[PDB]
Design a protein around this motif. Sequence first.
Motif, mmCIF file in Angstrom:
data_model
loop_
_atom_site.group_PDB
_atom_site.id
_atom_site.type_symbol
_atom_site.label_atom_id
_atom_site.label_comp_id
_atom_site.label_asym_id
_atom_site.label_seq_id
_atom_site.Cartn_x
_atom_site.Cartn_y
_atom_site.Cartn_z
ATOM 1 N N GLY A 161 27.348 61.688 5.818
ATOM 2 C CA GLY A 161 26.336 62.723 5.221
ATOM 3 C C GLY A 161 26.055 62.136 3.814
ATOM 4 O O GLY A 161 26.353 61.050 3.195
ATOM 5 N N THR A 162 25.096 62.843 3.365
ATOM 6 C CA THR A 162 24.213 62.502 2.252
ATOM 7 C C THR A 162 25.233 62.535 1.079
ATOM 8 O O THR A 162 25.225 61.507 0.208
ATOM 9 N N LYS A 163 26.057 63.698 0.693
ATOM 10 C CA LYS A 163 26.879 63.634 -0.434
ATOM 11 C C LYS A 163 28.037 62.492 -0.309
ATOM 12 O O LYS A 163 28.342 61.766 -1.336
ATOM 13 N N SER A 216 22.390 68.893 -2.181
ATOM 14 C CA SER A 216 22.164 67.582 -1.851
ATOM 15 C C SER A 216 20.744 67.065 -2.417
ATOM 16 O O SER A 216 20.448 66.132 -1.852
HETATM 17 CL CL LIG Z 1 25.819 66.195 2.456
#
Ligand SMILES: [Cl-]
Lengths: 248, 256
Positions: free
Chosen positions: B45-47, B237
């Motif tokens: 995921g993004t984070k 995010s």
């Molecule tokens: Cl994320």
Amino acid sequence: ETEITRIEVGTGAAARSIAMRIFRTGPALVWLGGYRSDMTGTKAVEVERHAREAGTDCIRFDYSGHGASDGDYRDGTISRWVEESLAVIDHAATGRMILIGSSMGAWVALRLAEKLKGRLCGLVLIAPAPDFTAELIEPNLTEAERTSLAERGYFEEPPEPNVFTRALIEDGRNNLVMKGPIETGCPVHILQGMRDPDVPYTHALKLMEHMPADDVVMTLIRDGDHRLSREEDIAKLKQAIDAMLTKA
Amino acid sequence: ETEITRIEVGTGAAARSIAMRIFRTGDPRRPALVWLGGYRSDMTGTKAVEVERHAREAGTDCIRFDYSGHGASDGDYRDGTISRWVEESLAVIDHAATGRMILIGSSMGAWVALRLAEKLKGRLCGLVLIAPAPDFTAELIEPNLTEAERTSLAERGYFEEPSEYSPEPNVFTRALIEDGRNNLVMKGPIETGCPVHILQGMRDPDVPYTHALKLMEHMPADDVVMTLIRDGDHRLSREEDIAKLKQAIDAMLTKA
Ligand SMILES: [Cl-]
């Protein structure tokens, strides 16, 4: 290090000399202190010290009845102190500025933010106490306290006791800023301690709720009190000023 | 990008393989960032990708992994519990997280990080909690259960929440909620033994920002700080949100 300069505010018997310390570097910072503080306090001294490192000016002054300015603080009102802040800004601020307000100074800063539309580039509110006469003092008045406000025009809070005048509470209702949406037109940063005994941290949260979506941030310190003058507290204040300076 | 390696966690019929992405870049105690994602999150995921990016930039290691039933790990998330996911996180930390650790837990991962902090007291030197959701079974799900959801929990052992973004509904099993009670951190005081920074958005629709205030009130009077973002949601995010996350990680890196 910075010498005191003065302007006269008000006419007639209301005329009063306002002491100021205007630092000029070789986007100014403006300080607005608390209810019974003065410009030589820890946080105020550290703000001009931050200006010395960021290469900018700093504007500090004492409200009437505070520090090196004329008058008795029991004769003051929010309107009177807002007037003095405006006069000091008009005299000293040669351009853009970041208002840094602590407790009652945050209330003054928010009133200045409305009339400022120099130009505002950022807001740093430290233990903000907006509308504290109507939000904090009035709902917690004992029947013996309001009896004093009725027969004596003031009331005393328990080495010298804080005196809140009837005029301060009445004028406070004409200076309420949490009347609705609060558009400052600039980024806002709030510093607040959860162990604050004078301004409950939920009061700062209620203030933040009144501000719209765009760039409002709060640094909530778990063990911080109302003064927020410990070295670690000042470190976060300096970081909040640094953020305001980088987005300007 | 980063290679996936695996360890077997648990014994007997409970054994399961946990997928990890271990990145390796003060000097004798090179700190490791450890990502701990939310419910049904993914270590890609993004984070999570930004945390490894921050480790690549800061010159530290990074420990990413998927809970059982998540991402590349084995299993069905509907068989998982907080106990099992804390168990796997501790095993991944014991296998890879060498020396000093900064756990970065998002939503449910913050609950796991707080449980790990209690059990680890290498050793923890900082906690970064993004949209923290400790005790979310007892604090957020249970008080808002409808009569129908309580009935389906008793009749079928789970209830479902339709998703407006994916065709697959969200499932909450009775086991997750029951086992949640054995993992509550917000019953009595919380001690982490390390400074804690919390990132929270006031506009969080899934975890009310007041929930993270309740968490802070359960923690001691020493170095617990929260960055409250007025317009932040639960994901946190956006580019500006990731920026504050990297600032929080850097702050934890400067305090040993
Ligand atoms: Cl994320």
